[PDB]
RNA sequence: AGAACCUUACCAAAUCUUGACAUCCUUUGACAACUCUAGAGAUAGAGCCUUCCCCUUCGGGGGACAAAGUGACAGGUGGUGCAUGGUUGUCGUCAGCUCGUGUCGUGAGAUGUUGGGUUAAGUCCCGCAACGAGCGCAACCCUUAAGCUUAGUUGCCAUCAUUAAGUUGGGCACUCUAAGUUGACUGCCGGUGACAAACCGGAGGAAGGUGGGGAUGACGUCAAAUCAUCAUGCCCCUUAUGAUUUGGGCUACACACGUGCUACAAUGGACAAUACAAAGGGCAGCGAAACCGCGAGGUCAAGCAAAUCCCAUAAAGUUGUUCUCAGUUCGGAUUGUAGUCUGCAACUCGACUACAUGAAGCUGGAAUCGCUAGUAAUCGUAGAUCAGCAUGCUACGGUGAAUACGU
């Protein structure tokens, strides 16, 4: 039931990257994911000159849901605040999911486009956050006097 | 490596019987001599045989067997017809597999 | 698939040699599984025992891609209702 | 569902009923032993032996049948065992030294009891009294508990059934038991009647 | 039927291998090991008797 | 000089550590660490024993290692490091045991049982 | 857990009758092989010789042969798993199920096993006309997680010398190897808790609450499966429901379903270089080097009954180049050709290589399956069975996370 975090991934010096890479490693090939994440994080610094830390942090800030819903029982669904661990997990999860749905041919450019367009408060991850925040916190009428 | 030597190899299917036989042979070997090599173990090869607990169907309920095989090595230097008898005289019990060599 | 060499049934050889030096026959009884057709096997009417009744087949010159091995199958319509 | 404890206790609380040099050629000596294991029925039928041990050195054969009636097998003054050797070497084609061995607490053993119960079941004796007197005699002999099960169409009757009258403790799922399981078969006019005797006679190791 | 195949696998053969290795006691040819030449069930059952050198414990 | 030697075991691998103080440089099997790990940029995790224990460092290291994949053995170095650093002084154990890196993992692969096959996948059921 | 034949029970034909085969009597005889002929073989038709061998005093006794008579007989994969032994699945590793002494109840029964607390567990504590016992969970066993002693070859080279090399001088420090022990047992403390059980935290330790895993599967349920492993009641066949051989067939083909393998490609395709395993097998078996060949493979012969030699390069993986979104240098299905190995024969039906084609297929609906951490996902390896043939099975290692808010 606990999490059993992963501590060091000083490439580049940060912690969210450590959790991120463990999702891209389809079929257990960690080096390819590490290489492409490094190439993409150097690319996002190359184009539209800035540091990778600022763009990544503010991008996952624009795409981290803060309220979320869960269903139970007729059909009712309780909006629920999200734990920070699950907050970042969902953020990275939907970020990678929509980077996949972007469908570009390059190792790195799709992720760079995704995070840098999120840095503009737009994009499919931002679209998912907006859709969830529209369905949620608008029907918080019924299941608010609950857990 | 070149030297006078007597070398033997031991095989049995019970660690207690094989090590007690090795101990008694070391006793007899250093009794009628010296500088004997101890009961050096060996990676003790195993076996395996997959078989289904069944008569007519149901291979799902498989079950396993093995035939563990202890192997032992002892070396003797500076031979004599005394260590020869100490080897070829007493091997009891007769579950062990002895092969005298030089 | 033998490079060791051909493998004509010697038994078919012994019969066919006498069958070929003089006038041939238009019907032959055999089993014809451990042999094959060669240039000297032309002009005969051998019968591979398909399993139920051996059917005599007349040797032609043009069967080099085809052989003596089999010509009358045992499946024999079909086994099925429909067709190819 | 259940398994035979002799197949689980083996290697730990008991050695094997046959021993020979462990060369990789097993078929020759194993099926030599098979011929002995077949031919020993010709002594079991009258002596009701327990089990045969067979040691096998390089050039000799030394065996030992656990029996309760040596007289039958040893002859008057040795009149039988040498003749047993003569009719044994004819198929063994190798020398042998048969050494009859006696079991202590003769009638407490499992295979002797199972053979006995099958025996009086052969001549149409009631199943209840035989097993009751067997278990009572076994408890007299001293033990921590025995079990006895019978199978088939009891009393020569309709569809088969299964019963048991167990007394004392008979630990089965433990692993330091050294229990003598046995088995037997019985036919009078119909099918076959098997038995599954169980005993438990103390905790002891072979070392 | 099995009875005549005991002779079939015993008699000489026209050439090298028209043979199959079956168990001596059990007539089942399938699932046999050349090390022992006993079938599946018989060698399993004789393992429980504690007659053949070796073990059945498994768990390895 | 003086040399401290403690073994390291993890994931069906074996490590023979040779620790000798110095400026700090490792050449595994007479070959540099970057020349032995694919790709790899995770050697800084191997420097964590030097980052929390013997801050900041460092000691020269020579090692010979065989068996198992690169991850299990590239991680086996750290337990030998911890053993040698405890041999040097028991002061370092208080900083070691609060973070681990000495407790050799007791977890390896598992046998296999009916249900698994050539790939480590469980069976399905009969639907419809 | 190996259907060319054999295996195989079934089919076609040719054949057999104490029979393919087993015991018994008589009768003998040591036992046969290679050739000629017929025959697809089975079989025979002949040459020829298998030739009283152990014990013999002329006989004989004898393992073993012999063909016939030959009566018991043999034989049946012939039916009944709803008569059975036995064996095996499933409920289900579910935590329950009962018995002895006493008591209550007219009795059937209850009582313990009920109630509270507690546990993965009828596990444990307390209370209670219930008290004890048994089967079961636990452990008892194997393996794995650490240390120590014993012993150092074929294993290892840390001090060295040397070498292509641990290959040899030596070394046994280290690793490793296998025997024995040490260790983990609420064991100690603090708190909670009917002061008890027990719970929580902490230290220590390599390992804290049956450590991880395996083996083990209660009384019994499914008249579960098996007479085709075997044994076996009853019934049926016998000049055939038995027996031999050759060939066919178990592999057919409008389709349905299951199980799995490979693709529908840019975490990718092809080429080049390059590091990292474990376990197992091998005697008439493993086939080292070398040479030949694009290749499957061929010559060769060293070493090897095994810590020695071989299978056996590990693969994924890492460094590079190129390909630049197409039915694509995608995919590799189909077909033909030319070849490799086994087997007598790869034609219905073996496997493999090279060339030639390059299909459907651009992540899949209703519905549905598996999985709580070395797991899944994913990559290779070996073994069994095996004259040759495994996407299957067993086993081994490599890599390897996401989440479990909560009932």
From Swiss-Prot, chain B:
InterPro entries: Ribosomal_uS10, Ribosomal_uS10_CS, Ribosomal_uS10_dom, Ribosomal_uS10_dom_sf. The keyword Ribosomal protein applies. The keyword Glycoprotein does not apply. One of its GO terms (cellular component) is ribosome. SMART domains: Ribosomal_S10. GO terms for molecular function: structural constituent of ribosome; tRNA binding. GO terms for biological process: translation. It comes from the Bacteria. Keywords: Ribonucleoprotein, Ribosomal protein. It holds the Pfam family Ribosomal_S10. Transmembrane segments: none annotated. Disulfide bonds: none annotated. Belongs to the universal ribosomal protein uS10 family. Involved in the binding of tRNA to the ribosomes. Part of the 30S ribosomal subunit. HAMAP family: Ribosomal_uS10. PANTHER family: 30S RIBOSOMAL PROTEIN S10 FAMILY MEMBER (PTHR11700). This is Small ribosomal subunit protein uS10. It comes from Staphylococcus aureus (strain Mu50 / ATCC 700699). The gene is rpsJ.
Swiss-Prot record, chain C:
GO terms for molecular function: rRNA binding; structural constituent of ribosome. Keywords: Ribonucleoprotein, Ribosomal protein, RNA-binding, rRNA-binding. InterPro entries: Ribosomal_uS19 (IPR002222), Ribosomal_uS19_bac-type (IPR005732), Ribosomal_uS19_CS (IPR020934), Ribosomal_uS19_SF (IPR023575). SUPFAM superfamilies: Ribosomal protein S19 (SSF54570). The keyword ATP-binding does not apply. GO terms for biological process: ribosomal small subunit assembly; translation. One of its GO terms (cellular component) is cytoplasm. Protein S19 forms a complex with S13 that binds strongly to the 16S ribosomal RNA. Belongs to the universal ribosomal protein uS19 family. This is Small ribosomal subunit protein uS19. It comes from Staphylococcus aureus (strain NCTC 8325 / PS 47). The lineage of its organism: Bacteria, Bacillati, Bacillota, Bacilli, Bacillales. The gene is rpsS.
Curated annotation (Swiss-Prot), chain D:
Binds the lower part of the 30S subunit head. Binds mRNA in the 70S ribosome, positioning it for translation. Keywords: Ribonucleoprotein, Ribosomal protein, RNA-binding, rRNA-binding. One of its GO terms (biological process) is translation. Residues 36-104 form the KH type-2 domain. Belongs to the universal ribosomal protein uS3 family. SUPFAM superfamilies: Prokaryotic type KH domain (KH-domain type II), Ribosomal protein S3 C-terminal domain. CDD domains: KH-II_30S_S3. GO terms for molecular function: mRNA binding; rRNA binding; structural constituent of ribosome. InterPro entries: KH_dom, KH_dom-like_a/b, KH_dom_type_2, KH_sf_prok-type, Ribosomal_S3_C_sf, Ribosomal_uS3_bac-typ, Ribosomal_uS3_C, Ribosomal_uS3_CS. Part of the 30S ribosomal subunit. Forms a tight complex with proteins S10 and S14. It comes from Staphylococcus aureus (strain NCTC 8325 / PS 47). The gene is rpsC. GO terms for cellular component: cytosolic small ribosomal subunit. This is Small ribosomal subunit protein uS3.
Curated annotation (Swiss-Prot), chain E:
Gene3D superfamilies: 30s Ribosomal Protein S14, Chain N. Pfam families: Ribosomal_S14. Binds 1 zinc ion per subunit. Its cofactor is Zn(2+). Coiled coil: none annotated. Zn(2+) binds at residues 23, 26, 39, 42. GO terms for molecular function: rRNA binding; structural constituent of ribosome; zinc ion binding. PROSITE patterns: RIBOSOMAL_S14. GO terms for biological process: translation. Keywords: Metal-binding, Ribonucleoprotein, Ribosomal protein, RNA-binding, rRNA-binding, Zinc. It comes from the Bacteria. GO terms for cellular component: small ribosomal subunit. Binds 16S rRNA, required for the assembly of 30S particles and may also be responsible for determining the conformation of the 16S rRNA at the A site. Part of the 30S ribosomal subunit. Contacts proteins S3 and S10. Belongs to the universal ribosomal protein uS14 family. Zinc-binding uS14 subfamily. HAMAP family: Ribosomal_uS14_2_B. This is Small ribosomal subunit protein uS14B. It comes from Staphylococcus aureus (strain NCTC 8325 / PS 47). The gene is rpsZ.
């Amino acid at each position: 039931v606990p999490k059993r975090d992963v501590l060091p991934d000083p490439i580049h010096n940060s912690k969210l990257v450590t959790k991120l890479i463990n999702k891209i490693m389809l079929d257990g090939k960690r080096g390819t994911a590490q290489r492409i994440l490094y190439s993409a994080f150097d690319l996002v610094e190359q184009r539209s000159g800035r540091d990778a830390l600022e763009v990544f942090e503010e991008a996952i800030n624009n795409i981290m849901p803060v309220l979320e819903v869960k269903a139970r029982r007729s059909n009712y669904q309780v909006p629920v605040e999200v734990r920070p661990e699950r907050r970042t997990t969902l953020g990275l999860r939907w970020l990678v999911n929509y980077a996949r749905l972007r469908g570009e041919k390059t190792m790195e450019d799709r992720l760079a486009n995704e995070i840098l367009d999120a840095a503009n408060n737009t994009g499919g991850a931002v679209k998912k956050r907006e859709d969830t925040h529209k369905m949620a916190e608008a029907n918080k009428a019924f299941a608010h006097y609950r857990w | 490596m070149a030297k006078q030597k007597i070398r033997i190899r031991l095989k049995a299917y019970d660690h207690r019987v094989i090590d007690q036989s090795a101990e008694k042979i070391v006793e007899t070997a250093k009794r009628s001599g010296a500088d004997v090599s101890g009961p050096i173990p060996l990676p003790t090869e195993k076996s395996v045989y997959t078989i289904i607990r069944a008569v007519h169907m149901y291979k799902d309920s498989r079950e396993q067997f093995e035939q563990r095989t202890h192997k032992r090595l002892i070396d003797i230097v500076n031979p004599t017809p005394k260590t020869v008898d100490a080897l070829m005289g007493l091997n009891l019990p007769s579950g062990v597999d002895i092969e005298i060599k030089l | 698939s033998i490079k060791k060499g051909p493998f004509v049934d010697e038994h078919l050889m012994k019969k066919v040699e006498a069958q070929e030096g003089s006038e041939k026959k238009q019907v032959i009884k055999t089993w014809s599984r451990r042999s094959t057709i060669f240039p000297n096997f032309i002009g005969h009417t051998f019968a591979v025992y398909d399993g139920r009744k051996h059917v005599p087949v007349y040797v032609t010159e043009d069967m080099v891609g085809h052989k003596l091995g089999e010509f009358a199958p045992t499946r024999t319509f079909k086994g099925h209702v429909a067709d190819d | 569902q259940k398994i035979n404890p002799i197949g689980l206790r083996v290697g730990i609380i008991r050695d094997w009923e046959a021993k020979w040099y462990a060369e990789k050629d097993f078929a020759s000596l194993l099926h030599e032993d098979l011929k002995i294991r077949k031919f020993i029925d010709n002594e079991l039928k009258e002596a009701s032996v327990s089990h045969v041990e067979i040691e096998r050195a390089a050039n000799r054969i030394n065996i030992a049948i656990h029996t309760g009636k040596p007289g039958m097998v040893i002859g008057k003054g040795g009149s039988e065992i040498e003749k047993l050797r003569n009719k044994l070497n004819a198929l063994t084609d190798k020398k042998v030294h048969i050494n009859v061995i006696e079991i202590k607490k003769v009638d407490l053993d499992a295979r002797l009891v199972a053979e006995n119960i099958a025996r009086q079941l052969e001549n149409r004796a009631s199943f209840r009294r035989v097993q009751k007197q067997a278990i009572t005699r076994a408890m007299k002999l001293g033990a921590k508990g025995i079990k006895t099960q019978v199978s088939g169409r009891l009393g020569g009757a309709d569809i088969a059934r299964a019963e048991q009258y167990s007394e004392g403790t008979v630990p089965l799922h433990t692993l330091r038991a050294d229990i003598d399981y046995a088995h037997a078969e019985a036919d009078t006019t119909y099918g076959k009647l098997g038995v599954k005797v169980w005993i438990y006679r103390g905790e002891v190791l072979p070392t | 039927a099995k009875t005549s195949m005991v002779a079939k696998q015993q008699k000489k053969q026209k050439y090298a291998v028209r043979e199959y290795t079956r168990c001596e006691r059990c007539g089942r040819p399938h699932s046999v090991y050349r090390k022992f030449k006993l079938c599946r069930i018989c060698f399993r059952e004789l393992a429980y008797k504690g007659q053949i050198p070796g073990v059945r414990k498994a768990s390895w | 000089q003086v040399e401290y030697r403690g073994t390291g075991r993890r994931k069906n691998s074996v490590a023979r550590v040779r620790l000798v103080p110095g400026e700090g440089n490792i050449t595994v099997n007479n070959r540099d660490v970057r020349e032995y790990l694919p790709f790899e940029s995770l050697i800084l995790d191997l420097n964590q024993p030097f980052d929390v224990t013997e801050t900041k460092g460092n000691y020269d290291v020579l090692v010979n290692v065989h068996g198992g994949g690169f991850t299990g053995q590239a991680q086996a170095i750290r337990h030998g490091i911890a053993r040698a650093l405890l041999e040097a002084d028991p002061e370092y154990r208080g900083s070691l045991k609060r973070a681990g890196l000495l407790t050799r993992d007791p977890r390896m692969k598992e046998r296999k049982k009916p249900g698994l096959k050539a790939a480590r996948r469980s069976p399905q059921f009969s639907k419809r």
